[PDB]
Ligand binder design. Sequence first.
Ligand SMILES: O=C(NCc1ccc(S(=O)(=O)c2cc(F)cc(F)c2)cc1)c1ccn2ccnc2c1
Ligand SMILES: O=C(NCc1ccc(S(=O)(=O)c2cc(F)cc(F)c2)cc1)c1ccn2ccnc2c1
Lengths: 471, 470
Amino acid sequence: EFNILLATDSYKVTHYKQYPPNTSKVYSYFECREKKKYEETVFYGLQYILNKYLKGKVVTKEKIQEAKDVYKEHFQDDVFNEKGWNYILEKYDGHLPIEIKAVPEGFVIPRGNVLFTVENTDPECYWLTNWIETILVQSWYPITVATNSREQKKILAKYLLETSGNLDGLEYKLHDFGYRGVSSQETAGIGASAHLVNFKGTDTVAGLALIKKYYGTKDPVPGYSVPAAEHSTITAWGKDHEKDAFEHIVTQFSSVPVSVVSDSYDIYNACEKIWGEDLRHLIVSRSTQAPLIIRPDSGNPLDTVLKVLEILGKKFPVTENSKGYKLLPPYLRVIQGDGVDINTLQEIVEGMKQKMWSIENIAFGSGGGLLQKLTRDLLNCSFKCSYVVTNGLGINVFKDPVADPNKRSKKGRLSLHRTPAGNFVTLEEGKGDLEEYGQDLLHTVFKNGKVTKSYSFDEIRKNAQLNIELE
Amino acid sequence: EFNILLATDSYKVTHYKQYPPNTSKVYSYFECREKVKYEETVFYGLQYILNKYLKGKVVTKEKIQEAKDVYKEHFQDDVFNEKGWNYILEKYDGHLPIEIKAVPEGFVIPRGNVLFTVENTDPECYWLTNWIETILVQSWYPITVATNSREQKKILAKYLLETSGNLDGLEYKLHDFGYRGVSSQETAGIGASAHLVNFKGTDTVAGLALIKKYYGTKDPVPGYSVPAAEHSTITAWGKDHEKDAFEHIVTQFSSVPVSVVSDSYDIYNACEKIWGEDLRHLIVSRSTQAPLIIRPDSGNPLDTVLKVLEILGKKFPVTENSKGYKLLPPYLRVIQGDGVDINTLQEIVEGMKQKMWSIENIAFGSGGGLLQKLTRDLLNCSFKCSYVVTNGLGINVFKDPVADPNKRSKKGRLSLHRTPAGNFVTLEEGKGDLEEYGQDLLHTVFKNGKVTKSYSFDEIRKNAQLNIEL
Ligand SMILES: O=C(NCc1ccc(S(=O)(=O)c2cc(F)cc(F)c2)cc1)c1ccn2ccnc2c1
Ligand SMILES: O=C(NCc1ccc(S(=O)(=O)c2cc(F)cc(F)c2)cc1)c1ccn2ccnc2c1
């Protein structure tokens, strides 16, 4: 079973002895710190952590004993605060005396703004605020995936609109391939759910169950996929029987969309000789609701896509859209699912526009670039203490390193407001109490062991929408 | 609860209809594909996955039903293989008819060798081999962490031996700060355990429980930490009371080692004026077994370390060791726990050597660099099919992309052997049956729902050791 007394950085076990004496409150906030691009971030993932790890009776007699035995051997000493954890057990039946206020999930906030604040509601539990830092900071991950996935959506939207005149199929242009490329099972589900905030296509099944259990949707499932081949299902037929492999597969999925990887031996031979001549008759007869989706999987991403399109364009009836861009027949599409990140995605769609190919022809699949190749310093997600109460007097606290102004932190009690121009501003030093800036957009989502406010996955999707989508 | 029927890439659900008719055997392998850095890898983590996800009754009527309802909505169609999973449920009581062979955990294998293989034991379950590719491939992560952690140990070992003459304290030179920098709780456990294969210092508690549950050690715990301050335990005293904070903290932990972060306002001021003058008397009186460890946490890593060292060198009695390198008094040490990954680690220790500072003075903390900033293409961890049997005839299969020779896969039944010079070789096309390279080095570790071979964390530590240590 999960034990919250063991879900923290080791040194935090010794922190209760290090605060100023007569301290009755510790107030801390979380922010995607601003750096001297990712100028706005999608706040998502907190609700998952609250339900799975923080709510309810998280402290038992046995968990305190287990933690005591582990920490004694871990530190070679008895630094564990048994009294403090016992207090919570007896006074609150193991419920955390903590109040967490947070901006609504799905919200899109510029960098350098408070996203959530954490404080203790019992004077005896001043130490509890930064005890659960580690478990709350890990929300940087669904925030970063959702933010980075959305930024890619922006790029796709821009070029799809310029080359086709609309945004049809936009929410299916970036597919999640990264189930195998992530570090663990829990990570898979979390990351996949963050991607689904912006898109509808995924192969990471783990994210589906997370959303149903923790967020919920009106629709049965939030993510979809289609039948497809991998290299094993093709190579199993033997080197000399790739055509037999291909033919068999498209016949098995004649009435639904089907993707087939064609780069096992020679991507350019398959597209020109096999798809383009030998099995052309099985392709041109397909429905618009069930196209063949050719999948190159190696070589330079831009160069391979262009050459595949160049080949297919000469073997199939190509039309020109109203914007003047070349479009494949509705039964034939291409997916690039190898080596795709936010950087190469820009290079490909930009290169496609150069050669007058519409973005309608292409979908994208991203593995580790979408889910794994992300760190906490990308958005500088940080958790800092800003306000404490010692001897009944509250002081505004902050760090301000001489060698790095970028690591300076906010002072005092914080609040998030709309500016008169409709932008966001974080008020410091409790200045939000002057009520010059309207209502604080931070809401109590957790208090004294209960989840006090919840959002469905539908609300979150609406919040994280693009301006180009609203228009 | 975990459901193995929902623990795979979505398109794999459709693959059973895609193999050639009359396929009775699918045989697949896992390797860190070959491409001057990371020439060898540490095999670790597969045992965790076998015990948590693959062993015992993993199929139930409820799980089959649950998967059926999910996939019908997921594909907007019925493509799920209910009969196949029902066969396993009835015929084997939910145990997976799967044979997995593998190299011992902890083993250091050069790139491009078979690390493990997977094949179905029942003709009816040919599709099962690659169904579990996704859960098995995720072992890239403990492998990559273990490997990148060990490569950092090589660097530290090299420079510690050079500037001190021995390897004392090496297993405590790279500390794990990665708990908050990782993508989840589960990853934190797996990643931290992978680090503990090479070192002993960790702050990620979750790694200890994983080792105890899945590997076990002779000692009560495989990892250790010391009391330390964070930026909140210092700043809470107010900007005008940093000295008050320092004094309170080093007095609470006056007989045990303690680390104090000193860059909240001015790192160079805290070292020169606060540690070096005002509270100097509290430092010089400390036991050697309980040193103060100063921790900067900002600025250029190398520049900050050197300047901090030069300041303390003029405030405290510095000696010179038998190698000619400068050494702080035994009650005073430094830890750099910011911006540390394998590249900057190399830059710092080399920089210290040039300025005649011993590596004995310093230890390193790493967060995302150690546990998060890693992907699957770093060691090119891959899972591919190499052998199938259709119509009672074995076929050696492979991929060979015309545009990428590096993505070429191995052919046929594989085996791992010792060369006459004592190196590793992977034999293809069943050539291991010729018995010209001796015995196969892979062991059977999973058969028909049962873990058939395991390793203690101590044995894994022994196998992973550096040559210089041996
Ligand atoms: O091919 C894979 N999956 C199948 C697949 C096929 C097409 C599309 S699509 O985006 O074209 C698409 C989406 C969709 F929802 C409706 C639709 F009509 C068209 C997406 C996904 C796959 C999965 C994981 N991987 C890991 C490593 N490699 C892979 C490969
Ligand atoms: O300071 C942190 N932890 C405390 C700490 C301090 C010093 C050493 S040590 O390597 O000096 C050491 C090790 C040991 F086992 C014996 C010993 F004597 C000396 C190790 C650990 C810490 C933890 C997580 N973080 C995340 C972000 N930042 C942090 C910081």
